[PDB]
Amino acid sequence: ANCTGSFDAISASDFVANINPGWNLGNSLDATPNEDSWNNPTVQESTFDYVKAAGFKSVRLPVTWTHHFTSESPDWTVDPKWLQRVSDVIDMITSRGLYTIVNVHHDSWEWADVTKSDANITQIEQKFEKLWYQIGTKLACKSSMVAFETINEPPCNTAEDGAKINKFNEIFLRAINRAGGFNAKRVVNLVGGGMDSVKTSQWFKTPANITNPWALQFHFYSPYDFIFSAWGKTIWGSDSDKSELDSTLGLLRGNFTDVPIVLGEFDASPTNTEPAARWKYHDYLIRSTKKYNMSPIIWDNGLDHLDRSSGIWRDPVSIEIITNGNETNSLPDSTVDTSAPSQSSSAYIYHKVGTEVTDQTLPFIFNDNTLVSIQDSKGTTLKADTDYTVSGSNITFPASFLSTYYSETSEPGLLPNFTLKFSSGASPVVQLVQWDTPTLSKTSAAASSISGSDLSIPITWKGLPKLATVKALLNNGTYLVDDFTQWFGPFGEARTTYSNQWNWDDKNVILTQATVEAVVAAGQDTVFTFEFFPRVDTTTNTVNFTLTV
Ligand SMILES: *[C@@H]1O[C@H](CO)[C@@H](O[C@@H]2O[C@H](CO)[C@@H](O[C@@H]3O[C@H](CO[C@H]4O[C@H](CO[C@H]5O[C@H](CO)[C@@H](O)[C@H](O)[C@@H]5O)[C@@H](O)[C@H](O[C@H]5O[C@H](CO)[C@@H](O)[C@H](O)[C@@H]5O)[C@@H]4O)[C@@H](O)[C@H](O)[C@@H]3O)[C@H](O)[C@H]2NC(C)=O)[C@H](O)[C@H]1NC(C)=O
Ligand SMILES: *[C@@H]1O[C@H](CO)[C@@H](O[C@@H]2O[C@H](CO)[C@@H](O[C@@H]3O[C@H](CO)[C@@H](O)[C@H](O[C@H]4O[C@H](CO)[C@@H](O)[C@H](O)[C@@H]4O[C@H]4O[C@H](CO)[C@@H](O)[C@H](O)[C@@H]4O)[C@@H]3O)[C@H](O)[C@H]2NC(C)=O)[C@H](O)[C@H]1NC(C)=O
Ligand SMILES: *[C@@H]1O[C@H](CO)[C@@H](O[C@@H]2O[C@H](CO)[C@@H](O[C@@H]3O[C@H](CO)[C@@H](O)[C@H](O[C@H]4O[C@H](CO)[C@@H](O)[C@H](O)[C@@H]4O)[C@@H]3O)[C@H](O)[C@H]2NC(C)=O)[C@H](O)[C@H]1NC(C)=O
Ligand SMILES: OC[C@H]1O[C@@H](O[C@H]2[C@H](O)[C@@H](O)[C@H](O)O[C@@H]2CO[C@H]2OC[C@@H](O)[C@H](O)[C@H]2O)[C@H](O)[C@@H](O)[C@@H]1O
Ligand SMILES: *[C@@H]1O[C@H](CO)[C@@H](O)[C@H](O)[C@H]1NC(C)=O
Ligand SMILES: *[C@@H]1O[C@H](CO)[C@@H](O)[C@H](O)[C@H]1NC(C)=O
Ligand SMILES: *[C@@H]1O[C@H](CO)[C@@H](O)[C@H](O)[C@H]1NC(C)=O
Ligand SMILES: *[C@H]1O[C@H](CO)[C@@H](O)[C@H](O)[C@@H]1O
Questions:
Q1: With contact defined as beta carbons under 8 Å apart, do 544 and 529 qualify?
Q2: In degrees to the nearest 10, what's the CA dihedral of 178, 179, 180, 181?
Q3: CA distance 527 to 530
Q4: Residues with Cβ within 6 A of ligand 1?
Q5: Which of 106, 227, 273 to mutate to test the pocket of ligand 4 (most atoms within 8 A of CB)?
Q6: I need a labelling partner for 256 at 20 to 30 A (CA). Which of 32, 35, 325, 431 fits?
Q7: What is the DSSP annotation of 302-349?
Q8: 234 CA distance to ligand 6 centroid (A)?
């Protein structure tokens, strides 16, 4: 490829500086087999208007090439129509002033997996170089506002596998420069094993005689328990929570001191996380990435944050924290003690159906900001010191005010929410929820009979239509899975993990098929306790389902 225009070379130091913060076009060009094969529609350019409008400077563009080869060995030719769509998407992003990073995505485990026992590594190395040569040529003439990323979370388990990770970086660089254009001065992102901080710290080595301006990219989905909703962990924000996060990011930067560091994916998704812990986590992540000179990019698979169809951010409180990292935000407080028998969150006004309406006190972490005003989701501004009262970290709400939203007999569900405008930082939102214990359409079932697939139990949600976690106990008292949760406190013992074991939708609570075969295998009746928010205790806001055997 030959390029007719000019190219403003940018340094890796400057590139990462100007991309902060970023957002992912998730489950789009990375979907399999086609871009709308998963949860997302055909990509539309308006989406990038929203990303710009919400304050992001850059867009990371994951692309799965696995299903877009028109020839096999040797040529391994990629469809020109796909290369054209990828090229056009990059144009939509840059032409709205957003920086771009494009990659080879789920090819990482679909065919580029070197840890698999039968992996033809010579055929992998060829197919990778054939691929980046074709990507390189088509994008060879793109402005410096486009960067190339080697490969997404590449499987890696050994020091021996890590050298194969570094080789992926070399094959990639030799292909992109042989493709010509502006690529010899294009910014690139090299990767380590699994894009894990430690695997990269343990095994990553910089390619010898490298000439492209380059930065390092890693992903952060830690701590596993809170981020993935495992073992009943529904709280984050303790001093140990903070030290462990700061420790993970600090040992990476300590290994790679003068290297620009891109945090390519991160997400405490509003789908599964409790809001106050979620907002505390993103605040301390942005705070951490700034301390270690790292530019973050949030993962958004289309459902976690931006609704592309409306321009509405589902979690606008988060978005403001990442897009204005130079401000101190005051956040609602929440339980962070792993041994507490009750859990609270200042992101909610909870009221139980059939109880008297009482005053509600929500502790906030003001962080030297002052409260300016409060606004409900119906447009009325609340009257200070009559409709709500501040005392230090407490923000107290009169029963007479709250009765103007719910009663002892009013319907259960989500009520309006309060948006609290502070002197600086993001403006957190408190959600009023009228809640009762949900009821299920079934209370027991023969594991044998319900076998086949996942077990859907229709549920009457009452309040928050989210499932918090599930307890799993055999009849003789042994835990169904993961014995080690016995050290996880009143809300963690015998609890199971989101998606793997339990799930939910609009009309059901879901036990995955794998859970049932753990009950069938255990061979004794198992009590599953579905738990919901608020977790006022381990028993009130719960409902039992038993699998007989
Ligand atoms: C969903 O189902 C739940 C279980 O089916 C049900 O919870 C049960 O509720 C009843 C009624 O209140 C409780 O009965 C009360 O129990 C106490 C003594 O309880 C303590 O000891 C029992 C018995 O332990 C012995 O047997 C087990 C056999 O599995 C052996 O391991 C053990 O070594 C003993 O020999 C024990 O089950 C209890 O343990 C529960 O609570 C502890 C402490 O929090 C947890 O660590 C543990 O996970 C477990 O949940 C308990 O320590 C007695 O004094 C009272 O008079 C009364 O009889 C049951 O204890 C309780 N059972 C369980 C397994 O929780 C829920 O009510 C129901 N929920 C809904 C919404 O319907
Ligand atoms: C405070 O209270 C207010 C209520 O007054 C809350 O505001 C509502 O928030 C929700 C979530 O942000 C929002 O619902 C979306 O509104 C749009 C209608 O204008 C729709 O575009 C959208 O549907 C998509 O999103 C759903 C939930 O996110 C998906 O379940 C659904 O399938 C839709 O997704 C389709 O399209 C996407 C495109 O990417 C694709 O991935 C999917 O496959 C699918 O095809 C929602 O209905 C409400 O509109 C908001 N209401 C108002 C008045 O603005 C606010 O969130 C509260 N704050 C809290 C709780 O913190
Ligand atoms: C560059 O990165 C590498 C890789 O991340 C990093 O080396 C790692 O350092 C950490 C600590 O900095 C080591 O973790 C220790 O591991 C052993 C077990 O192997 C334990 O003895 C230690 O635990 C102590 O403290 C714990 C706190 O929870 C307690 O559990 C315990 O009681 C102990 O007192 C500790 O966790 C880790 O093993 C190494 N990894 C390797 C492969 O060497 C290195 O420090 C980084 N360098 C720089 C300059 O940043
Ligand atoms: O729900 C729509 C599709 O979701 C797919 O899961 C996506 C998630 O939405 C995304 O947030 C997450 O980061 O990636 C997965 C993609 O799944 C793949 O992840 C990497 C590999 O290790 C996994 O084996 C692989 O499955 C889901 O895969 C689809 O089934 C849904 O249509
Ligand atoms: C591995 O791939 C190479 C290159 O495509 C091919 O020539 C070779 O036959 C394959 N080897 C095995 C053992 O499958
Ligand atoms: C905050 O609220 C708690 C419980 O409502 C109370 O014990 C504490 O003294 C309050 N602090 C104030 C009002 O400054
Ligand atoms: C409970 O039953 C399981 C079934 O496999 C068995 O392995 C376990 O040892 C039993 N333990 C107790 C304490 O009854
Ligand atoms: C948070 O506050 C609630 C009251 O709203 C308590 O029930 C809980 O124990 C925690 O202190």
A1: yes
A2: -170
A3: 10
A4: 473, 476-477, 493-494, 527, 529, 539, 542-544
A5: 106
A6: 325
A7: SSSSEETTTTEES-HHHHHHHHTTTSPPPEE-B---TT-SS--BTTEE
A8: 24
Question: Could you check whether the bond before residue 438 is cis, i.e. omega within 30 degrees of 0?
Answer: no
Q: Give the ligand with the smallest distance to the CA of 123.
A: 5
Q: Whose CA is nearest to atom 6 of ligand 8?
A: 344
Q: DSSP letters along 49-69, please?
A: HHHHHTT--EEEE----TT-B
Resolution of this deposited model, Å: 2.7
* CA atoms lying within 13 Å on the CB side of residue 91: 9
Backbone angles phi, psi at 505, to 5 degrees: -135, -155
Q: At what angle do helices 159-178 and 121-138 cross, to 10 degrees?
A: 30
User: What is the gyration radius of the CA atoms in the chain, in angstroms?
Assistant: 25
Token pair 């771009």: residue:
100
β 188-191/146-149 pair status: parallel
Quick one: tokens of 346?
């200042």
Query: What H or E segment, with its residue span, contains residue 523?
Result: none
Backbone angles phi, psi at 11, to 5 degrees: -80, 155
Name the closest ligand to CA 159: 3
CB of 186 within 8 A of CB of 176? Answer: yes
Domains of the chain, earliest start first: 12-326 (3.20.20.80), 348-435 (2.60.40), 439-548 (no CATH)
Pairing relationship of beta strands 294-298 and 261-263 according to DSSP bridges: parallel
Ligand 2 atom index nearest CA of 429: 61
| Two structure tokens written together for 446 | 């023969």
Q: In terms of DSSP bridges, do strands 99-102 and 146-149 run parallel, antiparallel, or are they unpaired?
A: parallel
Question: What CA–CA distance (Å, rounded) separates 364 from 52?
Answer: 30
Report the C-alpha gap between 347 and 274 in whole angstroms.
9
Is residue 361 in contact with ligand 8, taking CB distance under 6 Å? no
How far are the Cα atoms of 84, 136, 287 from residue 77, in angstroms, in the given order? 14, 13, 44
Q: Ligand 1 centre from 141 Cα, in Å?
A: 68
Give the distance (Å) from ligand 7 centre to CA of residue 511.
22
- From the CA of 340, the nearest ligand is 8
Residue 306 alpha carbon, nearest atom of ligand 2: 39
With the most atoms of ligand 2 within 8 angstroms of its CB, the residue from 40, 42, 305, 307 to mutate is 307
